[PDB]
Design an enzyme around this catalytic site. Sequence first.
Site, PDB file in Angstrom:
ATOM      1  N   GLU B 352       0.677  -1.160  -0.015  1.00  0.00           N
ATOM      2  CA  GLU B 352       0.055  -0.066  -0.041  1.00  0.00           C
ATOM      3  C   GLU B 352       0.890   1.293  -0.004  1.00  0.00           C
ATOM      4  O   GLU B 352       0.648   2.260  -0.738  1.00  0.00           O
ATOM      5  CB  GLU B 352      -0.966   0.052   1.109  1.00  0.00           C
ATOM      6  CG  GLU B 352      -1.951  -1.115   1.116  1.00  0.00           C
ATOM      7  CD  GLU B 352      -3.039  -1.036   0.130  1.00  0.00           C
ATOM      8  OE1 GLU B 352      -3.056   0.189  -0.476  1.00  0.00           O
ATOM      9  OE2 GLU B 352      -3.637  -2.144  -0.287  1.00  0.00           O
ATOM     10  N   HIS B 482     -16.338 -10.452  -9.758  1.00  0.00           N
ATOM     11  CA  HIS B 482     -15.973  -9.465 -10.744  1.00  0.00           C
ATOM     12  C   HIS B 482     -17.083  -9.687 -11.962  1.00  0.00           C
ATOM     13  O   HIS B 482     -17.064  -8.820 -12.590  1.00  0.00           O
ATOM     14  CB  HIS B 482     -14.595  -9.624 -11.261  1.00  0.00           C
ATOM     15  CG  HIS B 482     -13.651  -9.666 -10.251  1.00  0.00           C
ATOM     16  ND1 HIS B 482     -13.494 -10.292  -8.817  1.00  0.00           N
ATOM     17  CD2 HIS B 482     -12.852  -8.620 -10.057  1.00  0.00           C
ATOM     18  CE1 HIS B 482     -12.528  -9.784  -8.350  1.00  0.00           C
ATOM     19  NE2 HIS B 482     -12.125  -8.750  -8.883  1.00  0.00           N
TER      20      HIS B 482
HETATM   21 ZN    ZN Z   1      -5.729  -3.798  -2.683  1.00  0.00          ZN
END
Ligand code: ZN
Lengths: 98, 592
Positions: B352, B482
């Site tokens: 991240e 998805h």
């Molecule tokens: Zn992610």
Amino acid sequence: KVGGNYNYLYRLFRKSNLKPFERDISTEIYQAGNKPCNGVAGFNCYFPLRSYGFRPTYGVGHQPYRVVVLSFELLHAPATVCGPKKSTNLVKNKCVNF
Amino acid sequence: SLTEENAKTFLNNFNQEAEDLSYQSSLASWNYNTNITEENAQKMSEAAAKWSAFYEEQSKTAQSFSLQEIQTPIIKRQLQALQQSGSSALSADKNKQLNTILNTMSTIYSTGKVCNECLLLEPGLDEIMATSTDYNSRLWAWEGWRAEVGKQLRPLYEEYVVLKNEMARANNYNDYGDYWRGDYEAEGADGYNYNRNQLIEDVERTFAEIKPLYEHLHAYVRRKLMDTYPSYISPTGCLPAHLLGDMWGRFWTNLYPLTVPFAQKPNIDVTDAMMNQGWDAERIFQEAEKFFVSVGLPHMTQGFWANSMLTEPADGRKVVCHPTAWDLGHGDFRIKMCTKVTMDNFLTAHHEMGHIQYDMAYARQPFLLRNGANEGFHEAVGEIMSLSAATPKHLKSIGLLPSDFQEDSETEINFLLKQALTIVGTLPFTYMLEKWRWMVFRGEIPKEQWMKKWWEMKREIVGVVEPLPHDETYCDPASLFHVSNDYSFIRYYTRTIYQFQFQEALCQAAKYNGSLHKCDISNSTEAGQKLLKMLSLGNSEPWTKALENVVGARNMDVKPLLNYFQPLFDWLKEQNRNSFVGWNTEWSPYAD
Ligand SMILES: [Zn+2]
Ligand SMILES: *[C@@H]1O[C@H](CO)[C@@H](O)[C@H](O)[C@H]1NC(C)=O
Ligand SMILES: *[C@@H]1O[C@H](CO)[C@@H](O)[C@H](O)[C@H]1NC(C)=O
């Protein structure tokens, strides 16, 4: 302010650039295109003065920064603003430089 | 008097207003994510609605400036990034119908249950499909799920496909597949120009090279699963869909306990070593910041350590408890993550922080260009950081592994196998699913042969055979998250290719002599300034030019992927000598 300090304004659009030490406080609509604006905002008629969204959650590049500019003028008129003069102690019974 | 300066002024005004409106929307979203309440949710919804209304109004107003008159390339690109309407092309009735269908499909997928115990998707089905090894215990759950959710989403998905095709045709496109592939459409010079139709030809070419490695991996997995499934696996057949460690088979990481090269030497875990030293979340973030600064990247902002929620709140606040990198704007970059002292969270922190450093790079570009090159770049820039930070050399340099430890061959082979079970095993599934969705949206597959062609592609591409026959009454494609919820899936293949491309390009520039999977970009500033050259451009330049700045190629390259698992490739080729690499598309577990 947490909610937002929208009291500081800034001009973004204008016909031509300013001159050295010039002020403009007009609030007229920026006539961008050939369409003659009639005081209303919209297509090709944008407001020149926008507001700052000052909030404490900003980083280091968008926080409010206060800038002062001190410009000195030395016209032919006699000068009335001199720096702080120094001082010393007195001397008795001895020839010194006064 | 020219339209160029008028368009420039319009774009300046739009960016000036967007940098405030989108910032307020992101702030409302962060306030909702911190403390999930009703008032914060209402504020976030109102902010998002206002931002969407502003964006659609500006898009409707910007369509009056054709790109033929714009001479400046950056101004033309900014105008093109805004003139795209999207869902607003359809009428009010069609848009309402599409929204209702999407919401109904999302509600059916989220509230799905399989009972003959009686559980739901995430609580019981995931754990059973991940940990349980019984044939029937997984078969019944798989069949129930793909018979309930599929048959409940099929009639809605049939109309959803038609509505999406109508929207694509109204947006000057042809089909929904072309609209989804339009993200990889580049514009520029004669060498920096990419077309949507070229992606269809390039994806197959890139997949043709990863075929032998995937075949060897599948043969090895089959030979290792023959033990636990003696009377349910053929020596020259495919693998059942319910014996892949997942409900759909996207990630084969759950098969590591059953498919292990050397069990007497498990993988390296630094959880206890991190607990002994007394580390915590802030220590992990400081180590990640040190790693990101050592390579030669800009330093983190102060608000990242004060305004961001790095640890779980003990004040009773209910957070979604999943990693996310928020870029509110104006120099505000935060990370919301259920960070702990574990190793997976230790790597997710760096993953991240990679996206955060990416967001801190293209901030100098205009708001209409404050994004990655494509959907495959943003998630791949952060993955190489975790790939380079999870090496045995970095763990010894930081201090998680003592200096007396030495790299062993069996441990490296096990690590490569565990990484290939998650990285290499998902590429054929992604390619097959995307090809199926493209051929369905394009109208090449008739609506009476959806399941037939789907299972045929499962047998030919992924090498997966169904344990029970499923006619056209079911819809197994729609069973995926998805596919049910509107989202792209081709981004994962491009991400997997580009992460290895960037890894090789940044490891060859630092003059590293060794295996590709054991690279270490630390103590090498030249590996950062070469990467930032692509990170500082973002969307201001075509993705081919940004890719050329790092690796030199202006298209996808699968050679780094094959070079990453080269020792594992050789090991699998040597171990699969007494077997047939491949699978015949005629065996069926349901047939006698
Ligand atoms: Zn992610
Ligand atoms: C979060 O919401 C809960 C629920 O009302 C409240 O008790 C708590 O004080 C809130 N925390 C913050 C930081 O606002
Ligand atoms: C980088 O150099 C410093 C100082 O020489 C050293 O302490 C550190 O271990 C090095 N790190 C790596 C990853 O080589």
